[PDB]
Amino acid sequence: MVKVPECRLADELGGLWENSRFTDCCLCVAGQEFQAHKAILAARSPVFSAMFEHEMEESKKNRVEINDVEPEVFKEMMCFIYTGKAPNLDKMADDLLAAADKYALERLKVMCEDALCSNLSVENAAEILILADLHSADQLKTQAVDFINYHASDVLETSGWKSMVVSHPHLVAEAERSL
Amino acid sequence: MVKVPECRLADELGGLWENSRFTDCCLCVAGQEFQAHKAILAARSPVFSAMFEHEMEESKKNRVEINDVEPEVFKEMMCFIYTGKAPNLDKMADDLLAAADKYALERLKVMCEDALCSNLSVENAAEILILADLHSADQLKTQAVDFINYHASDVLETSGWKSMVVSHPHLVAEAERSL
Incomplete structure (x- = not known):
């Protein structure tokens, strides 16, 4: 009888990140500044969590330098942190996998493993297995191995x-x- | 092939609220203090949003007095703000409806409308319609009216x-x- 509307949690948090409201820290990726929210990042990433809990000296000024990651890839990782989604994951699944691995975002990692598995091909399968071993992507390693043996x-x-x-x-x- | 694990967004944010990490404001309900996060509350409630954006003087000290709401009901409303869920909604659906109405939490309102509709009875139907009109609960008003006419x-x-x-x-x- 009563129609409950669809949950908007993920998109409202996506709103915080997009419009930079009530932020309390700054992330600098290749000279670009991005304001964010410590509590959210900490809750979603063990790496971010320990950084903010144990590793910032006040003279950094709530301010995190990011060397390991391309800007576009970083945006997507952050869209994931705030919303659980990664709409452009297919165009960057190898670098996104690397990013999710470095920030210990398990689910995003596996989402990347899934995309990459669907792209297994004769020509790229060695490359994909290397990547997967590099980045501790277990399901993807296993799938690449099986694909290699079925197509040896x-x-x-x-x-x-x-x-x-x-x-x-x-x-x-x-x-x-x-x- | 690849099994993506279930999204944990809602529960990790539920973790922030439960263990009071990186909080930046305090809510006082009948003498009990609860630490919270402005950005989250603002993103989820237009009322909280405008309070924090336009209505706190620094001498309040990020500190919000809550007169309109019972403690147990307030906990549930806040569990909803952080996680989209309200596991004890059935034991308090009338007061929770009132709370969601005062903090303009539309979806929680409708979740309350749903519970209350399932409890429509001959004996309580007048009461429920009053409540629904009181609290601007449209679907519930309509359902109560129809139930009253089918059972006049x-x-x-x-x-x-x-x-x-x-x-x-x-x-x-x-x-x-x-x-």
């Missing part, structure tokens, strides 16, 4: 797989060990 | 309906007007 004939004939034999021989090991 | 024989014989004829004659009007 075509995959062995790729420059990417050849490159990898030299560059990361232990991955070749683990994949063979998948017997 | 038994309802007219209730002390509640009789009381109401005297106490709020214009409601009787609107219900008759539903012809």
Whole structure:
């Protein structure tokens, strides 16, 4: 009988970030400044949480330098922190995975693992496994290994797989060990 | 293939409120103090938003006196502000409706309207319509009116309906007007 309207939590918090209201800290990524809210970031990221709890000296002035991350990628990570969503994840899923790994955002990591799995191809599968091992992406590592074994004939004939034999021989090991 | 884990946004924000981390304002309800976060409250409630934007003098010290609301009801309203949920809504749906109305929390209002509609009974239907008109609960008003008309024989014989004829004659009007 009664129609309850759809929850707007995620979008109202997305509003805070977008219009910079009641902010209390500043994040500087390649010279760009972004105001944010410590409590939210801390609640969503163990890395941010410990930074703000143990690691800022007052002379930083609630102000965090970000060296590890491209601006566009950082915006998306932050859109995720505030809203649970990442609408442009497909255009940047490798760098976003790296960012989510560095800020220990588990779910975003897995969202990236999902996108990348759907893009597994003969030509990119070695690259994707490297990435996944690099970034502690377990489901994606497993999927890449399986994709490599189901397609081993075509995959062995790729420059990417050849490159990898030299560059990361232990991955070749683990994949063979998948017997 | 890849299993994305369930979003934890709402519960992590529920964590902020529960463990009072990075708070920046204080809410005092019947002598009890509760620390909170202005940005979140402002983003979720237009009332809280304008209070903090236009209506605090520094000599209040980020500190809000709450006269209009019982403690238990206030906890639930705040659990809603931070998480979108209200797990104990059924035991307090009339007072919670009043609270959501005073803090302009539309969705919580409608959640209360839903609970109360499911509890419409011959004996309480006059009471519920009064409440609903009192609190600008449109869907609930409409449902109570319809329930009254489908059950008008038994309802007219209730002390509640009789009381109401005297106490709020214009409601009787609107219900008759539903012809």
